[PDB]
Every structure is written in structure tokens, then in C-alpha cells.
Design a binder for this molecule. Structure first.
Ligand SMILES: C=C1[C@@]2(C)CC3=C(C)[C@]4(C=CC(=O)OC4(C)C)CC[C@]3(C)[C@]1(C(=O)OC)C(=O)[C@@](C)(O)C2=O
Ligand SMILES: C=C1[C@@]2(C)CC3=C(C)[C@]4(C=CC(=O)OC4(C)C)CC[C@]3(C)[C@]1(C(=O)OC)C(=O)[C@@](C)(O)C2=O
Ligand SMILES: O=C(O)CCC(=O)C(=O)O
Ligand SMILES: O=C(O)CCC(=O)C(=O)O
Ligand SMILES: [Fe+3]
Ligand SMILES: [Fe+3]
Lengths: 287, 295
């Protein structure tokens, strides 16, 4: 795999979207894993064109070290794209995976959606700061690698992921380090020695844990809009960064299955209920 | 007080006109503090009157178990009570203390509502298991006493709280024990040896309590006394509420709310800073209040 004698780089396993528990142990051991072909070939295609009109009406910032410097972001994927709401979010591998990360026996679905983002790294965009996704829930790093999982991300490539256009540089095994710190020169002892691994073709995805260090690289090209679809998924006890049950129209919620209504907060798991009853009753969604 | 009689733990008491700093320091020392006249007796009585039809229509569950039985719980306080939504949730002392607990520099409101629950302990109802309210967020005990706060409770007396009718039993300074476990025989070594103290209160008194404080409803030993409480459960912005208030509370009521009341119920977002900024509970980069028409 490496020339004999070489420094071996951090292991980044890769499974086919038809694999089994097998993908999960790669997640447990490394903190991430690639699912090659996560979304079908025409599915990803129909999806990208469907959000191209919305992506077109996002002006680009040319700035300050923020994650908005020449990186454009858009989250109304259920509204804008029939392919997303009808096909992509009903992956049984997605759910069979989430149930192994999040759900406890007897309690139903321990998870729901945090965000559905399309991230498009514009050419010349500086490399994104290194971070753990779970910094979104600021106390979580304090629990170290023994803490439970709060967040996972099915990070899917829309346009191809190269080392040129700044695909995500992962750091496998970052979830097993003994202290979880901010990744900067004052707080991180290993800053500048952190060994990355860049991450894929359209429809491939990687299933990253919230504990894993990562970040978008510099998009060094002149023409490449590098586009992605992040399926952020949190445990049921945590609050979504998107208010999906207030912006997704009721017309679309009626077309979703019970699992997908639970993912978007149109149905309870009790958490997110309505005075001892499922919020789905009051909304006109049960029997 | 008592006669070399053994003296129980101290539960500090303040009037609602004390300084939120004096109250907060007490809360920090003991993890719980009584605020007398948190709500005026005229406010508490109108509230009790406005929820009472809903309370009477709630059947009492009697069971053959320790099942947390014979306790009515009602959460649609905003819909049923003009006093609650117009006055009680507008307590400036409530928001002063919440900020000192939850709100970060340069982010605005770090908290929102988990629940608004009328809890009426029926005559004869058995005592509740000792618990910490942050057990609702099961990973929280594992951070121990150094952990951040996830939840505080403004537990108000609607009818008098007495030692006989089931006033809550609290364990002051249990937010400072070095290991947070569930309170059971397997996991808790002080099990059965834990000294509680009732929250004796008159109508309109609150106690403010951290999610780190061991406590439990007491046994209601009376035959006539339906012991009514109002629990204002308040969590940090990154945590999920028990109630989906933005989906059951009507928009007509949303539009009459102050901006900070809208934030409490999820009709409006809160800006969190990480280099980056993110409207938590937002709409693709903007406040959810825009798509809702709340300006
Ligand atoms: C299921 C329960 C949970 C898990 C959560 C809880 C919540 C949210 C409460 C506790 C925390 C809080 O701050 O708010 C209130 C007051 C409303 C009380 C009521 C319930 C819903 C609960 C219950 O109903 O048991 C039948 C319960 O009594 C208790 C204590 O055992 C629980 O820890
Ligand atoms: C404000 C940001 C936060 C705080 C959260 C975040 C979310 C939720 C994301 C990250 C984690 C996740 O699990 O999902 C996604 C992919 C959607 C990415 C986009 C943003 C909104 C964020 C950002 O865009 O900054 C304006 C950002 O890039 C990052 C990484 O710096 C952040 O940690
Ligand atoms: O866009 C990328 O390459 C990674 C972005 C990411 O993971 C984030 O925004 O948190
Ligand atoms: O009603 C009480 O006195 C305590 C209730 C309580 O602690 C709870 O329900 O979580
Ligand atoms: Fe990230
Ligand atoms: Fe409690």
C-alpha cells in the first residue's frame, strides 16, 4: 500500500454502497469511512441540477478566515429538490447506520436531522480551519473520546473531490486522541504536526464521526466549483441548527414516511412532543 | 429552629426584590434557592384559575405500582392562560438569572424553554424517585460537577407546598458531589442515606434549581390537598425541548409575544459564535422569524 519502509498514512477505509455492520466497524475503528456510490448515478445528477438555480443566486464573499470566504452554502434541499426529499433521504443504509450509532433498544429512533447543506468551495477559497463537527455542541469535546456520539455526517461529493479543488482533508483516528481541544496554536499541542488525508467521485460519501478532525482545503484551481451535500444527523436530545419543521411546507411533510417525518421534527420520538402526545396528531398526520 | 437536635441542610430564601446577583450567588453555592414572590399572589391565582378547566379534564392515573402515579401534568400553559403568556414568562428576574447561567459574550440568549408544566400532586400520591433533572440528557452526569449547566428549573408554588402535601425534597450541594450517578442501589453508594429538605413555599414562591441537584417530589400524605406547581424548565439553546412549542402554540399567540418570548418558544433564532457565526434553529442563513413574519 505504501512502499516498504515508508511512513504509513492514517487509514481511510472504503466500502461499496452495497456492503453491510461492516461499514460500522470501519467507522468505530477509524472515526470515518467512505461509502463509494452512496447516492445513485442519475440521483446525484438530478439533484445537482435541481439546486443549481438556488446555488446560482448565492453571491460569493471575497474576504477574514471565516468559513464563508469563497465557500457558498445552501440548506433548503427538501424544498428545492424532489430527488433529495423523495429518494436520497430514504437510504436504508443511512438509517441502518444511524440506528447503530444513535438508537437504543426499545426507544425507537435516537436520531434526527441537524442540517441538509450544499457546500460549494469556490476556486481560490482558502483552506477551512481544522475543527471537529461536534464543536457545534460546545461542551462535547470536554467528554473526550469516551463520550457518546452526538453528531455524524454523510458528506457526499456532488462535483468530484480532488486534491486540486480542496476536497476535505480528513484526520482518521482523531476520535481516539486522549484530549479533545480546539485545533489552534494556543490550545492544540499538535498544531502543525496534524497529519491529514484528503478525501471521491460524484455520489461517493464519507461517514465522518463528530469526533474527527477535518476541514476543507484550499481550492487551488481557476474553474472548479467543488460542490458537496452534507447530511448532518444528531441524536434526538440535541437541537437542530435548521428549523426544518417551520420552513419545510406541510404539503411536503405529508408525503414523507414516518421515519422522515421524525427526522425533520414533524413527528415525535417523549422528546419534541405536545402535552403527552405525539406532535404528529396535532399536525394532522396520524390516522 | 430546632432544640443538640440535628439541623437539616440550608435552603436559602430571598424575596423577588433581592438583587439577581445575591440570588445567583446563593444558587451557585447550594444549587437551589427559594425566590419568594417570584409571582404575585394575584398573578398566581389568576393563572391557577385559567388552567383549572384543563386540569379538571385530566384523569388521574392510579396504578398498582412507584410508577409516578396520581400526578396531573399539563403543558399547554401558553394556550390556556393569558396571565402566563403576558406576565409570567416576562419575569425580568427570570431572564436576569437565565443570562447569568447560560448566555455567552456576544451571542445573545443562550437558553430557551424545555417545558411549561403544571404538575398537580394528588392526595396520597407516592413520592418520586430521587433524580437530577439533567438525567433527561443522559450524557450530562458524566461531565460531573465541572460540567456546564444544561438545565435550570423555576418551580413555582401555585398552591401551598407543605411537608405533608408533597413539597419537593431537594438535596442542596449535590451539584458538587464528585461523581454524578443515577440514584439507585446498584450505582449510588449513598443510596438510602441521602438527606433531603422540603421546599416549603406559599403561592407565587419559586425555587430555582440546577439540573445537577438531586431531588424528588414528596409523598402527598393528605386526603384533600391537590398540590399544584408550575415548572418553568429552561435549557441551553443547543438542546432539544420536550415540547414542540413552535408547532402547537398558535401564530396569533406568537405574534403577540415579545422578541425574547418568541426566542424561548422557537419562533425566533439565536446567534451562536464558534471564527464563525450560526443562527441556531435557523432558516438557511436567516432568522426563522423572517419566514414566520415576526419582523
Ligand atoms: C419522563 C420524565 C423525565 C425523563 C423528564 C421530565 C421532565 C422534562 C420534568 C423534569 C425535568 C424538567 O426540568 O422538566 C419537568 C419538570 C417537566 C418532569 C417531567 C418529566 C417529563 C418526567 C415524567 O413525566 O415522568 C412521568 C419525570 O418526571 C422525570 C423526573 O422522571 C424525568 O426525568
Ligand atoms: C457556523 C458553522 C459551524 C459552527 C457549524 C456548521 C455546520 C452545522 C456544518 C458543520 C458541521 C456539521 O455537522 O454540519 C455542517 C457541515 C452543515 C458546516 C456549516 C456550519 C453552519 C459552519 C458555517 O458555515 O460557518 C458559517 C461551519 O462551517 C463550521 C464548521 O465552522 C461550524 O462548526
Ligand atoms: O466543505 C468541506 O470540504 C468540508 C466542510 C465541513 O465539513 C464543514 O463545513 O463543517
Ligand atoms: O413536583 C415536584 O415536587 C418535583 C417534580 C420533579 O422533580 C420532576 O417532575 O422532574
Ligand atoms: Fe466540518
Ligand atoms: Fe425533577
Amino acid at each position: 500500500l505504501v512502499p516498504r519502509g515508508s511512513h504509513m498514512p492514517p487509514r481511510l477505509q472504503r466500502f461499496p454502497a452495497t456492503a453491510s455492520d461492516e461499514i460500522f466497524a470501519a467507522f468505530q475503528e477509524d472515526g470515518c469511512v467512505v461509502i463509494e456510490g452512496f447516492i445513485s448515478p442519475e440521483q446525484v445528477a438530478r439533484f445537482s441540477q435541481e439546486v443549481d438555480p438556488a446555488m446560482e443566486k448565492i453571491p460569493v464573499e471575497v474576504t477574514n478566515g471565516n468559513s464563508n470566504d469563497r465557500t457558498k452554502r445552501f440548506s433548503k434541499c427538501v424544498i428545492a429538490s424532489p430527488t433529495f426529499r423523495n429518494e436520497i433521504i430514504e437510504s436504508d443504509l443511512m438509517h441502518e447506520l444511524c440506528d447503530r450509532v444513535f438508537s437504543k433498544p426499545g426507544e425507537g429512533m435516537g436520531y434526527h436531522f441537524n442540517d441538509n447543506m450544499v457546500i460549494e468551495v469556490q476556486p481560490g477559497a482558502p483552506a477551512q480551519r481544522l475543527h471537529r463537527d461536534q464543536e457545534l455542541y460546545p461542551w462535547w469535546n470536554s467528554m473526550g473520546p469516551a463520550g457518546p456520539e452526538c453528531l455524524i455526517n454523510f458528506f457526499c461529493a456532488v462535483t468530484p473531490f480532488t486534491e486540486e479543488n480542496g476536497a476535505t482533508r480528513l484526520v482518521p483516528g482523531s476520535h481516539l486522541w486522549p484530549e479533545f481541544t480546539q485545533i489552534n496554536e494556543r490550545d492544540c499541542p499538535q498544531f502543525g504536526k496534524i497529519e491529514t488525508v484528503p478525501a471521491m467521485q460524484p455520489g461517493d460519501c464519507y461517514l465522518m464521526s463528530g469526533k474527527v478532525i477535518h476541514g476543507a482545503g484550499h481550492n487551488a484551481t481557476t474553474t472548479d466549483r467543488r460542490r458537496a451535500l452534507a447530511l448532518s444527523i444528531i441524536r434526538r436530545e440535541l437541537r437542530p441548527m435548521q428549523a426544518f419543521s417551520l420552513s419545510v411546507p406541510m404539503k411536503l411533510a405529508r408525503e414523507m414516511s414516518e421515519r422522515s417525518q421524525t427526522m425533520f421534527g414533524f413527528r415525535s420520538s417523549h422528546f419534541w412532543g405536545n402535552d403527552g402526545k405525539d406532535i404528529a396528531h396535532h399536525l394532522g398526520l396520524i390516522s
